[PDB]
């Protein structure tokens with residue numbers, strides 16, 4: 001609960017502010033990127049002046065040895081692509097006093113690291129391990145929710161996306177005097193890099209499982225759908241399509257049809273990364289039908305078109321087919337609904353698209369049947385419960401700096 005928060009970083013009126021009430025002063029030095037669609041998201045750089053500093057309220061600088069506390073925030077880490085990234089630990093969030101007591105969040109190739117140390121020098125480390133040798137990653141260049149909880153007379157725990165990952169006793173810990181400041185700055189990184197950070201908070205209690213799941217599900221506006229990277233999905237923006245069941249397949253334009261039988265392919269660099277190609281297949285765009293923003297929200301009505309060199313083709317469910325699988329056809333488009341619309345929605349972070357006629361009657365969920373995309377009513381009564389592996393689940397991939405390919 002917000003009642004136990006002693007530091008709440010938000011962006012407002014072109015600067016960061018602490019809305020917890022303790023009033024810590026937050027200053028931005030150098031070049032700090034602020035995301036346009038969600039100002040609470042910022043990026044810091046490793047090779048040039050760039051940092052966000054929080055001069056903690058004196059009454060918050062924990063010098064105790066019994067005080068319980070927790071921290072949470074989301075971090076966005078670009079794909080590592082150089083050998084210099086392999087064994088190069090660097091801190092991104094620092095609250096260490098005179099190179100000794102305190103806590104800090106650092107990173108390294110395939111790692112997110114938490115360190116907690118006392119005045120004597122004793123410390124404890126928690127680490128989340130992930131990989132770059134994987135077809136599709138839930139971590140690389142995507143917002144990752146991190147949560148550290150500490151019970152002085154118990155354990156220190158690190159959570160990732162709401163789940164418990166590592167846990168160790170901090171009983172060997174005595175007096176812990178944190179730094180007066182909480183510095184967001186990439187320090188010790190031997191490469192030219194940056195990291196994204198959002199919704200950083202500190203609590204004076206040991207957050208429980210249920211309070212962590214709440215922070216995970218609420219912080220970012222839950223009514224707005226998300227793209228592949230975890231950012232807000234937008235109208236009038238090009239995206240590549242990824243089917244969550246057949247993640248190895250590319251969605252291609254055949255004639256006036258859409259195939260999903262071709263391989264996306266693999267992009268790799270020996271001993272650094274190996275992943276299926278994301279930027280392949282047709283580029284689509286989401287268009288509004290007949291407000292103050294371009295955010296695609298749950299239940300919104302919209303049109304989906306393939307963007308082919310300045311020509312847009314509306315995705316049309318061929319309702320002239322009696323079978324439940326109505327192949328998707330491409331029809332050159334501007335306001336003609338063609339007798340149908342698409343209901344945008346999602347189960348978790350999994351996007352769904354439901355083709356319906358004008359009277360609100362269901363035609364079918366976008367999916368595939370043989371080797372083609374189709375709108376099928378079969379999905380309504382055939383969705384696997386807790387798994388993204390459903391032919392009617394999709395992700396929209398925007399080509400961005402944090403993930404480069406051929």
Ligand SMILES: CC(=O)N[C@@H]1[C@@H](O[C@@H]2O[C@H](CO)[C@H](O)[C@H](O[C@]3(C(=O)O)C[C@H](O)[C@@H](NC(C)=O)[C@H]([C@H](O)[C@H](O)CO)O3)[C@H]2O)[C@@H](O)[C@@H](CO)O[C@H]1O
Nearest residue numbers: 245323324325367368369370374376377378379390391392
């Ligand atoms: C083929 C068959 O006899 N089944 C008919 C149904 O076919 C399914 O139709 C839906 C769309 O309406 C999908 O195209 C489905 O494809 C998958 C799927 O579940 O998405 C592709 C999966 O990759 C595949 N999994 C594996 C491991 O191979 C599954 C799987 O074969 C089935 O779930 C097992 O039954 O299928 C099509 O299989 C559909 O046409 C209905 C209604 O007309 O009639 C069935 O007879």
